[PDB]
Ligand binder design. Structure first.
Ligand SMILES: Nc1nc2c(ncn2[C@@H]2O[C@H](COP(=O)(O)OP(=O)(O)O)[C@@H](O)[C@H]2O)c(=O)[nH]1
Ligand SMILES: c1ccc2[nH]cnc2c1
Ligand SMILES: [Mg+2]
Length: 177
């Protein structure tokens, strides 16, 4: 019943596509194609509610980017736990989102992907601390094993819901419930 526009963002090679394909098709693509942008739809029930997920799997870091950022209601901000630059990139994606959507309050979830790998270069604590600073959830995932995949996406839907209710009551000006 309720539709949610989700946008998966992050540096090339962090597993944005693999995560999305795991959610939709339930298999791991060890393959690759970092250039194209796919979108997928999925009907799921979350907390007893029927959700239509419309997910954009981005490719890159323009007059295409701005539109999809305006369209998106929530953002899955993905880095890979063995890719320091991709973790650092999160700051820049967040700033870009807040600017395009002209808001300090945008539903987001921080996702640390590839947690199946050894010798991570980005510690769980540093990612947890960042998420705490932003006031957003942090979820660790492996698109390879499928661990945390549903949780990441469902958590983002829950964040969007909380924002919806927060907006109606706002901080001041109007109030509601
Ligand atoms: N070990 C491991 N490899 C992954 C994971 N997610 C993606 N990959 C691999 O990382 C490479 C890039 O993944 P891809 O989905 O194309 O990244 P994208 O550019 O962010 O969309 C591919 O070879 C994937 O098979 C993961 O969770 N664990
Ligand atoms: C943003 C979010 C989801 C989308 N699905 C198709 N285009 C999109 C843009
Ligand atoms: Mg991709």
């Amino acid at each position: 019943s309720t539709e949610y526009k989700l946008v998966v963002v992050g540096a090339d090679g962090v597993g944005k596509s693999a995560l999305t394909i795991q959610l939709i098709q339930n298999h791991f693509v060890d393959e690759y194609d970092p250039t194209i942008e796919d979108s997928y739809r999925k009907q799921v029930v979350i907390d007893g509610e029927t959700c239509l997920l419309d997910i954009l799997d981005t490719a890159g870091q323009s007059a295409m980017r701005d539109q999809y950022m305006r369209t998106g209601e929530g953002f899955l901000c993905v880095f890979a736990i063995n890719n320091t630059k991709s973790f650092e990139d999160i700051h820049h994606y967040r700033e870009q989102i807040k600017r395009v959507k002209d808001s300090e309050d945008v539903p987001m979830v921080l996702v640390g992907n590839k947690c199946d790998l050894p010798s991570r270069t980005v510690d769980t604590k540093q990612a947890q601390d960042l998420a705490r600073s932003y006031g957003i959830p942090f979820i660790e995932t492996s698109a390879k094993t499928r661990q945390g995949v549903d949780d990441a996406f469902y958590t983002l839907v829950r964040e969007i819901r909380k924002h919806k209710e927060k907006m109606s009551k706002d901080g001041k000006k109007k109030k509601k419930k």
